[PDB]
Design a protein around this ligand. Structure first.
Ligand SMILES: Nc1ncnc2c1ncn2[C@@H]1O[C@H](CSCC[C@H](N)C(=O)O)[C@@H](O)[C@H]1O
Length: 327
């Protein structure tokens, strides 16, 4: 569905706006060296320039969303990124030979530093065909992104892969299709390798059956791993209209659905979807802001923009969660 696929333009605008202002990279929390901090920005900057080459319409959407970002959104984007990153880094530091499967990867570039930083990491990006065709175009067209992946400019990979360049694979898959998904995994992952699964604003676009099948099945495919999921929740307090508001706004604006926003309207209900994993941690992004963000970062963020409305931040961030499931 082309509607769902374009929710990536929102995710990308947000990523890009946070880098522009200077929220990211956070070299401390993302564990970026001097050169990788520089590259982080340079890679995202080229990604936007190269997107422009491939799609005027895409670029215009991304561009206007960036210009109109507000501090509360940049804090959210920062929290989302460092929170996932912190979960990933802890596991990769502890587990040398690891595979990362990034489900609904959109324009995510976290592989670029991760692959450098962790010599024995293998990483697999998975999104709809149309989305991964565009990502493959940008990655190969841009000289700096090609170099970062050791890629050639001529797409030289065999279906099911658009990129199959050593420790990185970019592959198309409809994740509503469990058989296509498990088939795809059989040829790019191994059962016995500690596996991190990332679903960052992916499951929110899925019907409960499809998302629960995908959760169960993927967890069953690997002896051990960690699922890191980030998503909104509709919110459980009485008279909390966040979910209601969000669903209505997406249906009127984009014809877009978030089928289980109200079903998983709190962190505990959300986390319960990984009840097969022995170790489930769940926090809303406000809790992350208070628990994981050092005072040095809080001070560095204040230097960049005026967050005049901290309570507005808190309200939004209590409606996003980071779930960590380990088996
Ligand atoms: N059924 C499905 N199969 C594969 N990709 C899907 C999918 N449903 C949604 N997606 C992908 O999920 C992404 C959500 S936008 C999130 C992008 C990225 N994970 C980030 O946080 O920046 C879009 O790229 C969309 O195409």
């Amino acid at each position: 569905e082309r509607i769902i696929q374009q929710t990536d333009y929102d995710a990308l605008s947000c990523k890009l706006a946070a880098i522009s202002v200077g929220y990211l990279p956070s070299s401390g929390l993302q564990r970026l060296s001097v050169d990788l901090s520089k590259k982080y920005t340079e890679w995202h900057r080229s990604y936007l320039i190269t997107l422009k080459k491939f799609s005027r319409r895409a670029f215009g959407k991304v561009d206007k969303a960036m210009r109109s970002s507000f501090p509360v959104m940049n804090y959210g984007t920062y929290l989302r990124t460092v929170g996932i990153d912190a979960a990933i880094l802890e596991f990769l530091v502890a587990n040398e030979k690891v595979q990362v499967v990034n489900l609904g990867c959109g324009s995510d570039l976290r592989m670029l530093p991760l692959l450098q930083m962790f010599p024995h990491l293998a990483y697999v990006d998975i999104d709809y065909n149309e989305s991964v065709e565009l990502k493959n175009s940008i990655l190969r067209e841009s000289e700096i992104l090609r170099i970062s992946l050791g890629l050639s400019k001529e797409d030289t990979a065999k279906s099911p892969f658009l990129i199959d360049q050593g420790r990185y694979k970019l592959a198309a898959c409809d994740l509503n299709d469990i058989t296509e998904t498990t088939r795809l995994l059989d040829v790019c992952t191994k059962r016995e390798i500690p596996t991190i699964v990332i679903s960052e604003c992916l499951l929110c676009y899925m019907h409960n059956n499809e998302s629960q099948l995908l959760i169960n099945t993927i967890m069953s495919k690997f002896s051990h791993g960690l699922w890191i999921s980030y998503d909104p929740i509709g919110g459980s307090q009485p008279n909390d209209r966040f979910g209601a508001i969000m669903q209505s706004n997406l249906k009127e604006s984009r014809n877009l659905e978030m089928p289980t926003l109200m079903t998983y309207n709190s962190k505990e209900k959300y986390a319960s979807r990984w009840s097969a994993a022995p170790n489930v941690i769940v926090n809303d992004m406000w809790e992350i802001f208070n628990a994981q963000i050092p005072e040095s970062e809080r001070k560095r963020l204040r230097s960049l923009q005026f967050l005049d409305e901290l309570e507005e931040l808190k309200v939004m961030q209590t409606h996003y969660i980071l779930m960590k499931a380990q088996w």
